[PDB]
Design a protein around this ligand. Sequence first.
Ligand SMILES: CCCCCCCCCCCO[C@@H]1O[C@H](CO)[C@@H](O[C@H]2O[C@H](CO)[C@@H](O)[C@H](O)[C@H]2O)[C@H](O)[C@H]1O
Lengths: 54, 427, 276, 467
Amino acid sequence: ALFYGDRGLLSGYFGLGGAARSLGQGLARLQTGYLRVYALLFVLGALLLLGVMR
Amino acid sequence: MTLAILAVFSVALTLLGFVLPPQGVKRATLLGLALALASLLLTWGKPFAFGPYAVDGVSQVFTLLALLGALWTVGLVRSGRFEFYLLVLYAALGMHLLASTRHLLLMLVALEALSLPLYALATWRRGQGLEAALKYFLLGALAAAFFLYGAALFYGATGSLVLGAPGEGPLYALALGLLLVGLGFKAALAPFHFWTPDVYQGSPTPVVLFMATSVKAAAFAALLRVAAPPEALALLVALSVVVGNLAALAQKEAKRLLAYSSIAHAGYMALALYTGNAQALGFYLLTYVLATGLAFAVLSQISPDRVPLEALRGLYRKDPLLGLAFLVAMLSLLGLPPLAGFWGKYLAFAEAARAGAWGVLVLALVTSAVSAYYYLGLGLAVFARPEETPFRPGPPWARAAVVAAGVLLLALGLLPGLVLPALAAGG
Amino acid sequence: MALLGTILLPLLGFALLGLFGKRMREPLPGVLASGLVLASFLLGAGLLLSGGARFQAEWLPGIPFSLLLDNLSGFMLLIVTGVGFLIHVYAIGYMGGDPGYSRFFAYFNLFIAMMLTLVLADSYPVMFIGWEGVGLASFLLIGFWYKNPQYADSARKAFIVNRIGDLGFMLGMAILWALYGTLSISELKEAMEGPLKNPDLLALAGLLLFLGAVGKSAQIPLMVWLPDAMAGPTPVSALIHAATMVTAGVYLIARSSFLYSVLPDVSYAIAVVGLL
Amino acid sequence: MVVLAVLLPVVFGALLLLGLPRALGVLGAGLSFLLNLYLFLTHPGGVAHAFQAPLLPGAGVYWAFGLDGLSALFFLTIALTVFLGALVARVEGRFLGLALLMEGLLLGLFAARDLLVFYVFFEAALIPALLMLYLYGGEGRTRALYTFVLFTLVGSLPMLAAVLGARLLSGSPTFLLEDLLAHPLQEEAAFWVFLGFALAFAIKTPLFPLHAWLPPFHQENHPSGLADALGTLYKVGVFAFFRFAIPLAPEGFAQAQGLLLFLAALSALYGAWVAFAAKDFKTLLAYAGLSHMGVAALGVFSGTPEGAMGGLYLLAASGVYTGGLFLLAGRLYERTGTLEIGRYRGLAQSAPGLAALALILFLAMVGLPGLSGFPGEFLTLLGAYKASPWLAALAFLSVIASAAYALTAFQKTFWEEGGSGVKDLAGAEWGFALLSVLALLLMGVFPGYFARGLHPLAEAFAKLLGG
Ligand SMILES: CCCCCCCCCCCO[C@@H]1O[C@H](CO)[C@@H](O[C@H]2O[C@H](CO)[C@@H](O)[C@H](O)[C@H]2O)[C@H](O)[C@H]1O
């Protein structure tokens, strides 16, 4: 029982792995290849950094 | 003067290349870059201040590295169009200027000086290369606009266009942010990093080597000159680190994964900015330019237009020393002891913690541990069974290049007390 | 030193039958074995007749290595080594034409040595070398003819069920250390002159000691292991059931008499479990 | 002196990696063994053979080395274990060089007299560990590797935040352990630093929820399992706690201590309990290791000089018989072809007193008194009961499970019905048996001599948790 349980624990850690995988290919999916998108995300970003400082 | 060598060689070679064979012009640009570099080594600890131009420790180290990138990138590009060396000289001088002033407007001029010929170097005329050039150029010009408006707001909040001017309240801050936009874009910090993957994947590989090393170097040199505030610094860091490594996980192509890797690495480097130590940053970028330069030379020996990760596999059997040097590069980029990369990362982290930026620091460390996924997925992949993969096993030039520069890495991993004593003022 | 001789003889002897053993013809290992037991009984009874014996030496800090030979120890020594001797000389006969003569008598000397280490002990941990040792030697012997699945599981159950009680032994042993800080039966008795301290806790220690004894002398609930110990050769059953092993169950209570005599509650339970 | 002993396996290993052949590196493990053993029987006190050299000074980083009572004992333990692995081997794809390299790295790891160099070695040892995992065996090499590597490093890199904080927040001039201790942290700084040490040390201990890397690792190494022995010598977590995590930030250790004792306890019980279910020697030995480390960590976590000395001792001595069981599992693997316990049942009578060797080792593992496991296990019990009696008991519902798995496996691997047959014992395997059992018997019968140096360190680093 506890053996297979432990197998499930390791499995869950792998689950975290896949969580980082998922989030990762989500952040890489942000780059469509479309330049207008890049400009939008850019201006947005600038607004963000500017919003943080003063 | 280094600037003298660069100017002379550039202007001369422009018209001399009409009377010279392309190869002879390569010999030329090589010699000139080398001479600039040598002039640098001979004046180590000179500080030579002219007008807005100023050669101190920062200019010395960062233009040393940038010139090293120019040297290596020129080495690999036998392809005969004398401009495809000339422009590298142009860019090189420009990067030097960029690292050599606190003058905002001369800085802008230097930014255009280095980034204008690069838009051109993104052309192996590949349809994807053209896309890269276009993206790089548009996003670049917009960033330029922001940096210029930042300079005008800096001159707004203070009577000067020189960095080091005392600095007001709100308008000063707004100015620094508007500068950090353009400068950050140029160093591939989030959220100003979008261009990097497309451009690295799209551009011809040796050109990409030139970019990911020299450009980043000069960019950070110029970032040391800015009074970068803790808050903005934190933002840039956290975003660049996270997006860097995490997006890097999803990459199935080599160059693009290395671009994302460079975004995360810019993230780590920015930590040094917390104190603006510059001794740390210098070291870090020494290790980085070495290992990245190596990696991209190796990635050049496979394919210039694009490289899938499978191509890396079996590299050891093919060339043992390129396999080993590539692994070493991957480990030094991981920041794993006893390699120089570990010392660079440590030296930046050190300034982060010294500055008391703990949450940011820890975050960086966690996702840095994450980064061990993909750095190993290459270095180890060296030993896998070879897929049918393109390989031009290089000249003595490149083999001894990758090998020597590689040896340097663990050489400084064991003995950072060699180069670190004076990456400072030069004593 | 000579006291330690009594223990070392069926070990310096034991080791020969494991190291060599098959190097010899087949009246011999029994003769060596029974000879060392002979001159353990003898050359320990000389000590007993000399008035008694002692040994104290280097071990873990605060917990020295002590053998005491007094009347209560001499009695056990004579029972174990004497009856053991006779059963050895018998085993020379009943074990015959059986390969593993060397195995058998090596295990026998091992057993004897362990039991002597058990009875000759002035500190509970050395006594514990005794307990676990004797249990181990029981395991080796119960599963002597190992080619049998039943006569393996027998010994497995031995060294497991026994270790259940051994755990209690350990626990009580620690309680009688947090409390007193001596762990040596003599100075543990001399420090239990007086008002005692935390009598509830002391009762716990004695109770875990008892729950230790239960396994080794096969009292309930750990009764269940002993009937299955039949698996090994007959004279093994003789040694385990009469001259050794289960005897230690009683002997531990007898040495720890200073502890149980001040425990009205616990002794009651001990007697009840005995009768049950 | 010290640096010679740290470097000797490193150079011999390096001379092995490229140079070859094995034997010149086997006598290398022998030379390191004799040197370290000589070093065990000589030194008077805590300092021993000091070493101090500049490395990054201005950073506060120095090459600093020396042998406590503890360091000496481990130099002996490690040199021995690895040497046994070397003369037995049957791996010898000439990566015994990687083995010696990792040996030297670990030796440096224990001789490390300052925090950052300790860190350096802690992570650097990961390199051979990961290599001999990748390029020298296992179907699931890659998953075991990325799991092991990512685990240790996700624990490790944030510890760097703590190692910095240890010096920075305390205002300590350098990274030298002595200086760092001469400058105490305050609460909610000592908390965080201790925590940052504690994740990396618990995960590398391993403690219960953080142990999941251990079974995949031990399965996918070369079936002989030299890399497994060395992987077990890389289980430096408990030591790391005792020497570093606890003394540098005791205020935090105080808060975490209940949880730590808990995790240690249930790690012991749990490990030994599921150890039963293992159907291969790799998995079995792995979970058994988890149990042992549970016990050791329990010993340290208790405060109590007794328990601490016991835990450190247990770690030391368990290195030898765990490594040994791994190597032996490999040696019956080589003659049979599988690490499955069930198949190829009766080996005794086909094999000589190989049954004796294996059984001696298994008895050392279950902690039979007179063998190495018991002294440490016992002092640990002594201290644990002082700390929290209930967790001492819970954790010591273990010995039952230990006898269970060890004797079940032993019976089904050796005692039952005769199989095909086997080899007897190799000329190397005899050196193995002799030297091994000699060691087990000496550390089990004279735990007086070994661990004498453990005494002052134990009570002093116990009073550390006092006033
Ligand atoms: C300081 C010096 C160290 C001394 C300590 C050495 C003691 C080792 C002995 C341990 C058990 O030794 C035991 O006896 C022998 C030795 O090969 C083995 O027995 C084998 O040889 C015997 C010899 O009569 C055969 O009869 C038997 O069929 C066979 O199984 C057996 O496998 C082993 O389990």
